[PDB]
């Protein structure tokens, strides 16, 4: 369209023309650890492609991170999409869709939203800190989402201006980082095809603070420009990997001559960089002009009067020029939407590639059926309306076009979760401005307008009166689990509706947020941490609902389990006094629930392979390995339902008629649970006996589902019940001295330190610990305050561990406001939660039985 837009190097018509060609588009997610330079890198790219936008001499301008809370905190909170046109090394301009994701672990869900609509991942790793917790988590999540992976080793200047390492030691640090990343990838990925090494161009070395971005190819091209006769590709092949250079023969050999010469990387790449940086920071007034002339860089008198940091940025911008190394890395290794469509459909689309529409989407053809898929919901500045952001997988979305939007519950058999909406407008989403466009072809990111009403988290945009076999994309599988639970109410109940509206809005803004209302009319928000919930509540108070809101103290969501089999075979009949079901409950084997959660086993598999797996990995009986019905409450739920009814006593055909009802009851019971209405975890349910009424009208429906839930509850209760606390994994980056002090903090919060290894090449240590989530509130603040701010920690959900106490212990006396001792913490955690949910004071073991 035609509208006012900021001055840019390219032209908007060229940008629109690049969108049509799906071979020149790169969907890239810039992920990494907290404060590793992703946002500054995007800012450098924006400065390169926008002449009028310049970074302040003192404040690191951030084109992304546009939110007020992001600006004040300094921590990226929401993913920012940026569509630019970047020149390659050869000069060929490519269209780049970059989803700048937050680095904080609490907002890892955000990165997941940026991984569904991207084909490639660029992981930013600090050259000083190295591989951290979020880098490992994001590597696992990316290689598990079937995405191409490249690495940008950011902040190499820290190796020069902070650590002051010798160039060979800097090379050793970079090589160690690359090796550790390769080891992580090989550990999380069976295939060894995606080896990452700067020789292959998979790795780029960057300093977004000083705009020093280069790969081996780009810097070899710099050599080619200064000396024409050299071919840059072969030189870049020879630049890395302990290959020494002989200037007597002008040849590169694996054998080191003179026993004192440095590697090719150190001699040709690292040492010139050290010389440039040292000349700028140390010998500016006395010896900067000579080195500037030797490099061909000419600076004005007013430019040479700048401070050292701006002068470094200017000199390195003039030397390295555009970030062409990044473009090479993301062009040669990150598939285009044309190339990368097939893995995306095979992984995310529910119908699979084998379906006709899957084959249609495998081509990513602009002139096909519309199959846009939006995973983000961006609120306007006023906060009233939301724009659904996502990539177009097939067809072409047009402004002012009728559209069928499919929700997360839309299925072919049940199409009720679908709505016909009229698209209002379409924007190409740059960070601080949006380019309104009439249409968006397949393979591009778009901010659809007017489709926000029927969607909360995930959408499937398609065209109406067509695609009658179209299915939805799989909902976002999240890296972590939302645990921290907070109750929210209004200060003035008269303005309750506003808060409710606000809840809806936050439910749209945060992909992993879960807002519900319990039995006691208490509004519940689930988050991944205290910073995440702080940002959520700031949004809920200022952006969406401008009302004053009271927030309860934070509590965690516990799980329920059993530790030994049921004392007696529990049973329940239907209200019809027929259809008797007799079940027992037993704990699962070690790691079986982990196997189920991590998709190692799926109920979608055939009977043969599932039975073989359960017979070989966990040594189950063939009958026991073939009688498994369902996995827990949801798909791949931690619980297991089996029927041990021998065919002699129970007709299998008759039982199969009520199999759906019994499975529904099992799933509902495991989702709710009888202790404190919490998820039942790691419990094996065996159907010992099942009487079934022959007539269809006396079974099924509301008769067998509540009966199944009742018998599940009885089997769970008679078996010794226990509660699972959520245990977070904590990584502390602390100085060497502070390590001891860290232990002290974890002494007061039931924290177990697993390892305290140092950071190779860095003066700090990474103390890893396993702290209870319920005890983690303020632990970050306690650690930073006790150590004068020198120690920083990031906590992420790790596992579920049984609470020491016994929940069903009526002998325990609990004062209303006292931190209870460990031996009965579970007793405190069960009743109080039972009061928060609104259930009875206590639960009896025979409450759901039939005798009483």
């Amino acid at each position: 369209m035609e509208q006012t837009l900021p001055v840019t190097v390219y032209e908007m018509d060229f940008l629109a023309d690049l969108m049509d060609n799906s071979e020149l588009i790169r969907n890239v997610t810039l992920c990494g650890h907290l404060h590793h330079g992703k946002t500054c890198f995007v800012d450098c790219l924006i400065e390169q492609t926008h002449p009028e936008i310049r970074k302040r001499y003192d404040q690191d301008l951030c084109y992304t991170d546009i939110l007020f809370t992001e600006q004040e905190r300094g921590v990226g909170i929401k993913s920012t999409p940026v569509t630019v046109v970047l020149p390659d090394t050869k000069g060929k301009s490519y269209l780049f869709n970059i989803m700048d994701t937050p680095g904080h672990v609490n907002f890892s869900d955000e990165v997941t939203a940026g991984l569904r609509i991207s084909d490639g991942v660029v992981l930013f790793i600090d050259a000083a800190e190295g591989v951290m917790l979020n880098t490992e988590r994001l590597i696992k999540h990316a290689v598990q989402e079937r995405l191409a992976v490249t690495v940008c080793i950011n902040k190499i200047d820290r190796l020069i201006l902070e650590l002051k390492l010798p160039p060979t030691d800097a090379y050793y640090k970079l090589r160690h980082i690359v090796d550790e990343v390769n080891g992580l990838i090989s550990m999380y990925s069976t295939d060894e095809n995606l080896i990452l090494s700067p020789l292959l161009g998979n790795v780029c070395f960057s300093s977004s603070q000083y705009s020093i971005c280069f790969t081996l190819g780009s810097f070899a091209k710099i050599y080619a420009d200064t000396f024409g006769d050299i071919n840059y590709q072969e030189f870049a092949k020879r630049l890395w990997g302990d290959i020494y250079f002989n200037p007597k023969t002008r040849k590169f050999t694996k054998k080191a001559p003179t026993s004192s010469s440095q590697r090719s990387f150190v001699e040709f790449i690292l040492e010139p960089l050290y010389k440039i940086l040292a000349q700028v920071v140390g010998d500016v007034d006395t010896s900067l002009p000579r080195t500037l002339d030797e490099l061909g860089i000419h600076l004005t008198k007013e430019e040479l009067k700048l401070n050292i940091r701006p002068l470094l940025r200017l000199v390195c911008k003039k030397f390295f020029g555009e970030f062409t190394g990044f473009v090479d890395m993301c062009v040669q290794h990150i598939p285009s939407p044309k190339v990368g469509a097939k893995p995306k459909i095979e992984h995310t689309y529910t119908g699979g590639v084998d379906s006709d529409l899957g084959e249609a989407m495998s081509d990513c053809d602009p002139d096909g059926p519309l199959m846009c898929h939006t995973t983000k919901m961006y609120s306007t500045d006023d906060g009233v309306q939301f724009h659904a952001f996502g990539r177009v997988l097939s067809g072409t979305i047009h402004a002012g076009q009728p559209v069928k939007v499919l929700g997360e519950n839309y299925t072919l058999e049940d199409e009720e979760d679908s709505q016909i909406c009229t698209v209002g407008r379409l924007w190409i989403s740059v960070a601080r401005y949006h380019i309104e466009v009439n249409r968006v072809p397949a393979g591009n990111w778009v901010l659809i307008e007017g489709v926000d009403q029927p969607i909360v988290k995930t959408a499937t945009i398609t065209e109406p009166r067509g695609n009658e076999e179209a299915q939805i994309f799989r909902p976002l599988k999240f890296n972590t689990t939302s645990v921290i639970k907070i109750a929210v109410e209004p200060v003035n109940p008269s303005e309750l509706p506003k808060m409710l509206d606000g809840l809806r809005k936050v439910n749209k803004s945060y992909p992993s947020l879960t807002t519900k209302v319990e039995e006691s009319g208490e509004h519940v928000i689930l988050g991944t941490g205290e910073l995440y919930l702080d940002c959520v509540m700031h949004d809920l108070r200022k952006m969406y609902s401008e009302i004053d809101i009271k927030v309860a103290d934070p509590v965690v969501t516990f799980c329920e389990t059993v530790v030994e089999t049921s004392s007696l075979k529990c049973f329940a009949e239907t209200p019809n006094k027929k259809n008797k079901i007799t079940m027992i409950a037993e704990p699962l084997e070690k790691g079986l629930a982990e196997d189920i959660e991590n998709e190692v086993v799926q109920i979608t598999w055939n009977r043969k392979k599932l039975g073989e797996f359960f017979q070989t990995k966990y040594d189950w009986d063939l009958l026991a390995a073939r009688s498994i019905w369902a996995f827990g409450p949801d798909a791949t739920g931690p619980n297991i339902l089996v029927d041990d009814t021998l065919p002699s006593e129970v007709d299998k055909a008759l039982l199969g008629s009520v199999k759906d009802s019994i499975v529904q009851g099992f799933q509902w019971g495991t989702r709710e649970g009888p202790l404190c209405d919490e998820l039942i975890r790691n419990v094996k349910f065996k159907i010992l006996d099942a009487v079934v009424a022959q007539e269809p009208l006396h079974r099924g429906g509301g008769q067998i589902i509540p009966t199944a839930r009742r018998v599940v509850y009885s089997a769970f209760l008679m078996a010794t019940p226990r509660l699972m606390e959520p245990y977070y994994f904590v990584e502390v980056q602390a100085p060497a001295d502070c390590v001891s002090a860290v232990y002290t903090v974890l002494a007061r919060r039931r924290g177990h330190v697993t390892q305290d290894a140092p950071i190779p090449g860095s003066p700090l240590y990474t103390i890893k610990a396993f702290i209870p989530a319920i005890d983690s509130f303020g632990f970050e603040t306690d650690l930073r305050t006790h150590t004068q701010g020198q120690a920083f920690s990031l906590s992420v959900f790790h596992h579920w561990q049984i609470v020491p106490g016994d929940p069903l212990d009526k002998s325990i006396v609990i004062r209303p406001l006292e931190p209870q001792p460990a031996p009965h913490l579970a007793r405190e955690f069960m009743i109080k939660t039972r009061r928060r949910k609104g259930l009875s004071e206590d639960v009896s073991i025979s409450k759901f039985f039939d005798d009483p």
């Binding site: 907290l34 404060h35 905190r73 300094g74 921590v75 800190e129 902070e162 002051k164 390492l165 160039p167 030691d169 050793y172 090494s197 020789l199 292959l200 050599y223 000396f227 050299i230 092949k237 020879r238 290959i243 002008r250 050999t253 694996k254 040492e271 010139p272 050290y274 010389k275 040292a278 000349q279 920071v281 140390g282 010998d283 500016v284 007034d285 907070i486 702080d534 509540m537 108070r541 004053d548 009271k550 927030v551 309860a552 100085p735 060497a736 919060r749 140092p758 190779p760 700090l764 005890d775 509130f777 303020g778 603040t781 305050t785 004068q788 209303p816 406001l817 931190p819 109080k832 928060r836």
Partner: protein
């Protein structure tokens, strides 16, 4: 007029050395966690005092906690207590641990730890593996050596003639992380009144062993 000044880096290094007694040699604002201006504003707006921080009269009228009439929301029979929710927790996350966050400024979160290794021995090389740095434990689709790759005689490292470090390189690298009056090399002259020589002294935490009057 004596209004603008520009200095060469050796002069600024000597000045930074001569003023080392008046500077805490901090290289981060992480020392000022929950103890900076924004944290103090958050504390004042919430009518709460940081231990090391000052105390103010309430910004708004505060209602006694004994006035609330035991709603289901603030029922203590439902609240699970593990650790006392300190004032620091509420200042760090004002919108999570406060029921009425008004005029509260979000405190700056963690900044990356500056790991600048300060050089003590001038005789040592500027780019030297200091013992503070943890030694790195050592241990590739390389091209074959027999191939015919040749480098032209015109080609050499970009700054091969340039020495890696100079006598005044460590001084400049130190000046990178100096306090604000010394981070610069050009600036504007200030009034003698306008320069607080001891402002950073009380902006930092009070020393651990001090009498009651100096802490106040």
């Amino acid at each position: 007029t004596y209004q603008r000044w520009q200095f060469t880096l050796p002069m600024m290094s000597t000045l930074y050395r001569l003023a080392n007694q008046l500077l805490t040699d901090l290289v981060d604002d992480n020392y000022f966690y929950l103890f900076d201006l924004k944290a103090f504003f958050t504390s004042k707006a919430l009518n709460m005092a940081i231990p090391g921080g000052p105390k103010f009269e309430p910004l708004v009228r505060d209602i006694n906690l004994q006035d609330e009439d035991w709603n289901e929301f603030n029922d203590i029979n439902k609240i699970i207590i593990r650790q006392p929710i300190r004032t620091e927790y509420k200042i760090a996350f004002p919108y999570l641990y406060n029921n009425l966050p008004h005029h509260v400024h979000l405190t700056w979160y963690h900044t990356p730890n500056v790991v600048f290794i300060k050089t003590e021995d001038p005789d040592l090389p500027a780019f030297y593996f200091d013992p503070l740095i943890n030694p790195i434990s050592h241990r590739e689709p390389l091209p074959d050596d027999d191939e015919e790759f040749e480098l032209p005689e015109f080609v050499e490292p970009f700054l091969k003639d340039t020495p890696l470090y100079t006598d005044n390189t460590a001084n400049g690298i130190a000046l990178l992380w100096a306090p604000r009056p010394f981070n610069l090399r050009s600036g504007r002259t200030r009034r003698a009144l306008d320069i607080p020589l001891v402002k950073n002294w009380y902006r930092e935490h009070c020393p651990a062993g001090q009498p009651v009057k100096v802490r106040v």
